[PDB]
């Protein structure tokens, strides 16, 4: 799947878009957030003020189902 960063996350991660082979959302986030811990707490739980869209829809609707290779994951910070 394709990961797109929005807002301050772009400068904080130092990239805007990246592809990852992971089909499990948590693993996608861990690969992105590996040595930085910017969007995940130590418990790998998402930090507050971060939303995730999968193909334009809130991630929680998907119930941790298999991601397809062509899915677009948007990570969006909010106030």
Numbering used by the authors: 2 to 80
Give the original sentences from the paper that presented this experimental model:
The eukaryotic Urm1 (ubiquitin-related modifier-1) protein, which displays both structural and amino-acid sequence homology to the prokaryotic ThiS and MoaD, has been proposed as a candidate for the evolutionary ‘missing link' between the eukaryotic Ub/Ubl family and the ancestral prokaryotic sulphur-transfer proteins1617181920212223. Covalent attachment of the modifier, referred to as SAMPylation, occurs between the conserved C-terminal di-glycine motif of SAMP, and specific lysine residues on a variety of target proteins, in a manner reminiscent of urmylation and ubiquitylation. Here we solve the crystal structure of an Urm1/SAMP homologue from the related species S. solfataricus, which reveals similarities to both eukaryotic Urm1 proteins, and other archaeal SAMPs. Taken together, our data suggest that Urm1/SAMP modification acts as a signal for substrate recognition by the archaeal proteasome.
As predicted, the S. solfataricus Urm1 adopts a ubiquitin-like β-grasp fold, formed from a four-stranded β-sheet packed against a central α-helix. Similar to Ub and other Ubls, the β-strands are organized in the order β2-β1-β4-β3. Four α-helices are also evident, with the first connecting strands β1 and β2, the second and third located between strands β2 and β3, and the final helix positioned on a long loop between strands β3 and β4. Inspection of the surface hydrophobicity of the S. solfataricus Urm1 structure revealed the presence of a solvent-exposed hydrophobic patch in close proximity to the C-terminal tail. This surface is composed of the conserved hydrophobic residues L52 and L54 on strand β3, I77 on strand β4, and I79 on the C terminus of the protein. A second exposed hydrophobic surface is also present in S. solfataricus Urm1, formed by the residues I19 and V21 on strand β2, I33 at the end of helix α2, and F16, on the loop adjoining helix α1 and strand β2. We observed in the structure that a leucine (L67) on the final loop on one Urm1 subunit protrudes into the hydrophobic depression of a neighbouring Urm1 chain to form a dimerization interface. The structure also reveals a narrow hydrophobic channel, juxtaposed to the first hydrophobic patch abutting the C-terminal tail. This trough is lined with the surface exposed conserved residues L27, L47 and G50, and extends from the base of the C-terminal tail to the opposite end of the structure.
